[PDB]
Structure formats: structure tokens, C-alpha cells
């Protein structure tokens, strides 16, 4: 929207994404990124 929230994973793209933050991991996460498991969520 305005440089407010961006996927923690630097590898992620710049294009718009799904603003999904992890309860345990404050870092921003995407809906698709989950399937990739690039972040390695503790509850995933
Ligand atoms: Zn992402
Ligand atoms: Zn997480």
C-alpha cells in the first residue's frame, strides 16, 4: 500500500502480496509463501 508491510523473505517479489503475519513471527508472510516453506514457520 505505502511501504508499510513487506514480506520478511527478501527472496520474495516486490509485487503486491498477501499481508499475512505470523502470531509467533512478527515478520510479514504471504499466503503462497507458506506452501514454499521458505520462512520455516514454527507452527507449519
Ligand atoms: Zn513472501
Ligand atoms: Zn512464521
UniProtKB/Swiss-Prot annotation:
Name of the gene this protein is made from: ZFAND1
Binding site for Zn(2+) 2: 22, 25, 39, 41
Function: Plays a role in the regulation of cytoplasmic stress granules (SGs) turnover. SGs are dynamic and transient cytoplasmic ribonucleoprotein assemblies important for cellular protein homeostasis when protein production is suspended after acute exogenous stress. Associates with SGs and is involved in the efficient and specific arsenite-induced clearance process of SGs through the recruitment of the ubiquitin-selective ATPase VCP and the 26S proteasome.
Quaternary organization: Associates with the 26S proteasome; this association occurs upon exposure to arsenite and is reduced in the presence of ATP. Interacts (via AN1-type 1 and 2 zinc fingers) with PSMD1; this interaction is increased upon arsenite treatment and occurs in an ATP-independent manner. Interacts with PSMC4. Interacts with PSMA1. Interacts (via its ubiquitin-like region) with VCP; this interaction occurs in an arsenite-dependent manner and is necessary for the recruitment of the ubiquitin-selective ATPase VCP to stress granules (SGs).
Domain statement: The ubiquitin-like region is necessary for its localization to stress granules (SGs) in a VCP-independent manner. The AN1-type 1 and 2 zinc finger domains are necessary for the recruitment of the 26S proteasome to SGs. Both the AN1-type 1 and 2 zinc finger domains and the ubiquitin-like region are necessary for efficient SGs clearance upon specific arsenite-induced responses.
Zinc finger extent (AN1-type): 4-44
The species this protein was found in: Homo sapiens (Human)
Protein name: AN1-type zinc finger protein 1
Annotated localization: Cytoplasm, Stress granule
List of residues binding Zn(2+) 1: 7, 12, 30, 33
Included range, full protein: 7 to 47 of 268
Superkingdom of origin: Eukaryota
